[PDB]
Design a protein around this ligand. Sequence first.
Ligand SMILES: O=[N+]([O-])c1ccc(O)cc1
Ligand SMILES: [Zn+2]
Ligand SMILES: [Zn+2]
Ligand SMILES: [Zn+2]
Ligand SMILES: [Zn+2]
Ligand SMILES: [Zn+2]
Ligand SMILES: [Zn+2]
Ligand SMILES: [Zn+2]
Lengths: 219, 222
Amino acid sequence: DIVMTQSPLTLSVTIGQPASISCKSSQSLLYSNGKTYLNWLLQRPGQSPKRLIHLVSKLDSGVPDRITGSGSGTDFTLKISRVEAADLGVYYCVQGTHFPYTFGGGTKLEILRADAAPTVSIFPPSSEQLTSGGASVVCFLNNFYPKDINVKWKIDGSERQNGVLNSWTDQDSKDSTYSMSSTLTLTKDEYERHNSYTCEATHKTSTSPIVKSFNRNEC
Amino acid sequence: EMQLQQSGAELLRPGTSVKLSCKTSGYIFTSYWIHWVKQRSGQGLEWIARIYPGTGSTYYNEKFKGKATLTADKSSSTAYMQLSTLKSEDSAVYFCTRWGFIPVREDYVMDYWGQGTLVTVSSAKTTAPSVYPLAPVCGDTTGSSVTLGCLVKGYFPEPVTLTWNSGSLSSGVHTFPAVLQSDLYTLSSSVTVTSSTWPSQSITCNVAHPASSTKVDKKIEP
Ligand SMILES: O=[N+]([O-])c1ccc(O)cc1
Ligand SMILES: [Zn+2]
Ligand SMILES: [Zn+2]
Ligand SMILES: [Zn+2]
Ligand SMILES: [Zn+2]
Ligand SMILES: [Zn+2]
Ligand SMILES: [Zn+2]
Ligand SMILES: [Zn+2]
């Protein structure tokens, strides 16, 4: 089958700047009728894919002409002349010249923006949960940029690496930021045996760890 | 207006089969090819097969012969794809699409896609989630604004539906992707409001887990 190689794997561009994606094929995509069936698709977060270009450079109806496609043979390029917020997502090249049809691996386009320090929130176990014999301590690290961040949990001054569950959101199309959730789960008995619970983050926006904690006690 | 409506998420046992449906409207069903595409783990797309409903003619990607069987019902304008003897690699999201290529004109018409059907191949059992309200203490963000949370855990399989104030509250909410651990998923969502709103007016977390017929509303009390 034809192998389609896309580069780069990800690109970070500031709104207003140009961006271009490359797609290389293992066989020439020139069909015997002289036509080249190379398409470009965009799959926005949580959406189905959508065709942007067909026949190498022809734009589908309703697609902004800021988008341009070019190439022939085994080399093709998609170029966005001016990046906008709505351009966030994954771009794929697909060939229909040889059977079976094959797709490239995709290129994720992320909007490069100003650094943003996380807004951190920490939540102790709810009464309902404690009742069931479990205890989860949740920490939300909201709206930060860049995406690269490191969070560690500490109980009474010692790092706890077991029982941690982390989840991240994709880039927000409203402000180009990322958010992440970290949950530490313990038994109710162990929870009620410690004092301090600390959510500690490492991020570019600070030379020292970003900290949020609480002391569980009684009264 | 063209519309391709796909069937709901499926949890399938290893070795069994499923029939997915793609109901179309807004165009002459018998005049265009319907293609089926598979997406695994995220950015990993594959072309499966295509069918021309008008005649029932089909073509398959060799990899999928014997795995997928496409049919179409002209009377209801519905395309189906049956997947047989499911195994690990079959867990994925499947899309149907009216690709829009017109051979005679050697040109295209707009592509319309279904929303996708998620298939989970597992023998693990269905479990309803526990929903816990997360009221601040330190996660108060002081005054100005405050963030509340909702923790959904111990459920199987995906998906779960989580909203705030029955959909009314959609701004400042962050719903995190569920993470699988020990055969059970965990999901959480945060909502940031002004100090002036909460606890003054009530904020409620709404959760639904279709697979187990669970629907629960949790109120964030202080
Ligand atoms: O994704 N699709 O439905 C496709 C992709 C490429 C192609 O040539 C035909 C159909
Ligand atoms: Zn060929
Ligand atoms: Zn050939
Ligand atoms: Zn200790
Ligand atoms: Zn000690
Ligand atoms: Zn301790
Ligand atoms: Zn101690
Ligand atoms: Zn055209």
